[PDB]
Design an enzyme around this catalytic site. Structure first.
Site, mmCIF file in Angstrom:
data_model
loop_
_atom_site.group_PDB
_atom_site.id
_atom_site.type_symbol
_atom_site.label_atom_id
_atom_site.label_comp_id
_atom_site.label_asym_id
_atom_site.label_seq_id
_atom_site.Cartn_x
_atom_site.Cartn_y
_atom_site.Cartn_z
ATOM 1 N N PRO B 1 -9.399 28.103 15.615
ATOM 2 C CA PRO B 1 -9.570 28.072 14.160
ATOM 3 C C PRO B 1 -9.713 29.468 13.581
ATOM 4 O O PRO B 1 -10.103 30.398 14.291
ATOM 5 C CB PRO B 1 -10.874 27.298 13.986
ATOM 6 C CG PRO B 1 -10.859 26.337 15.139
ATOM 7 C CD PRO B 1 -10.263 27.108 16.281
ATOM 8 N N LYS B 32 -14.938 23.614 19.003
ATOM 9 C CA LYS B 32 -14.050 24.432 19.814
ATOM 10 C C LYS B 32 -14.831 25.556 20.485
ATOM 11 O O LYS B 32 -15.831 26.034 19.936
ATOM 12 C CB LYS B 32 -12.956 25.065 18.946
ATOM 13 C CG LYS B 32 -12.233 24.101 18.031
ATOM 14 C CD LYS B 32 -11.355 23.154 18.816
ATOM 15 C CE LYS B 32 -10.504 22.318 17.881
ATOM 16 N NZ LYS B 32 -10.437 20.899 18.318
ATOM 17 N N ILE B 64 -5.832 23.766 14.114
ATOM 18 C CA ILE B 64 -4.942 22.760 14.678
ATOM 19 C C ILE B 64 -5.786 21.499 14.821
ATOM 20 O O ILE B 64 -6.572 21.367 15.760
ATOM 21 C CB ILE B 64 -4.352 23.214 16.012
ATOM 22 C CG1 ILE B 64 -3.523 24.486 15.817
ATOM 23 C CG2 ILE B 64 -3.485 22.118 16.610
ATOM 24 C CD1 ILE B 64 -3.054 25.107 17.125
ATOM 25 N N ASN B 97 -9.530 26.871 0.917
ATOM 26 C CA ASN B 97 -8.324 26.106 1.204
ATOM 27 C C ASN B 97 -8.288 25.744 2.685
ATOM 28 O O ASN B 97 -8.438 26.622 3.542
ATOM 29 C CB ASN B 97 -7.073 26.909 0.838
ATOM 30 C CG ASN B 97 -6.802 26.932 -0.651
ATOM 31 O OD1 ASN B 97 -6.924 25.918 -1.337
ATOM 32 N ND2 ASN B 97 -6.409 28.096 -1.157
#
Lengths: 114, 114, 114
Positions: B1, B32, B64, B97
């Site tokens: 990320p 993660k 992802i 975002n």
């Protein structure tokens, strides 16, 4: 196509000619005239990768077409290679986000490409 | 990320351990390993929010997977909380975002994550 | 909406009032209330367009809706017009990426717009 590199590597470690080399290599890799290629390098950034302040890069490649599974693997080899050779950034400390843009969503010269 | 914060807050107001805190908090929040978390803070920016140049931030979180309605609300509470506490930015002056990237569109280590 | 400009034009060439003009003109063009509009200008950038370091800009406009074929053409005319008049950047040296964001993928004020 548009390629953006954000890195903690300092400005003085960006070699002369780097933007032109990126332009030329991206034109050849995407099979497009260099007149379409825009490049943007942002050194001296406050960033970390895996919590480490060792050299790293966060990048984007936006294109109308020429984006896909195999093509993106090839771009990543090319671009990580350039970042390793020119900026001394390890490939496992680079992320490149790929964006396949619709022509209607890219503005240029007072209009869009649609 | 990957988490990016662009802000008009001056660099001296970014606490020394901020990148490491973002890394650990996002590792926990995304589930993660921290080795995969990239963080990038860009202070001193010329920006306005609602026409005003009081402290504000424009941010992005790319991952992802691990992106969705409820997950993004949780990330927003977590990240607005950190920006308010550490950078003194009001939550109503922050945009984040969120991008759910396909693995084939994320380059890393000379290839992609596909 | 969020509008970001990245340009090699130097900071001193960005006129007083530029962020306010962008905010107002984006409110006029999108119809969105100005209180929701964020603008961000990044001068002094290392960039090239078509292999050349003449003035250029790479921009993005993100919005929840108000993005589409005809709308993006109108925004490009407006925004290239402002970049030409205020920053002296030729419209054919500007790219603008348009993003129609889902409300669930935009964080604000500890939550999202969903």
């Amino acid at each position: 196509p548009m390629f953006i590199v954000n890195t903690n590597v300092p400005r003085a470690s960006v070699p002369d000619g780097f933007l032109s080399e990126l332009t030329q290599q991206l034109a050849q890799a995407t099979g497009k005239p260099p007149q379409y290629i825009a490049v943007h390098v942002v050194p001296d950034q406050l960033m970390a990768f895996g919590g480490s302040s060792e050299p790293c890069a966060l990048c984007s490649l936006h294109s109308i077409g020429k984006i896909g599974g195999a093509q993106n693997r090839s771009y990543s080899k090319l671009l990580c290679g350039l970042l390793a050779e020119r900026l001394r950034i390890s490939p496992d400390r680079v992320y490149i986000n790929y964006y396949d843009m619709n022509a209607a969503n890219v503005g240029w010269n007072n209009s869009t490409f649609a």
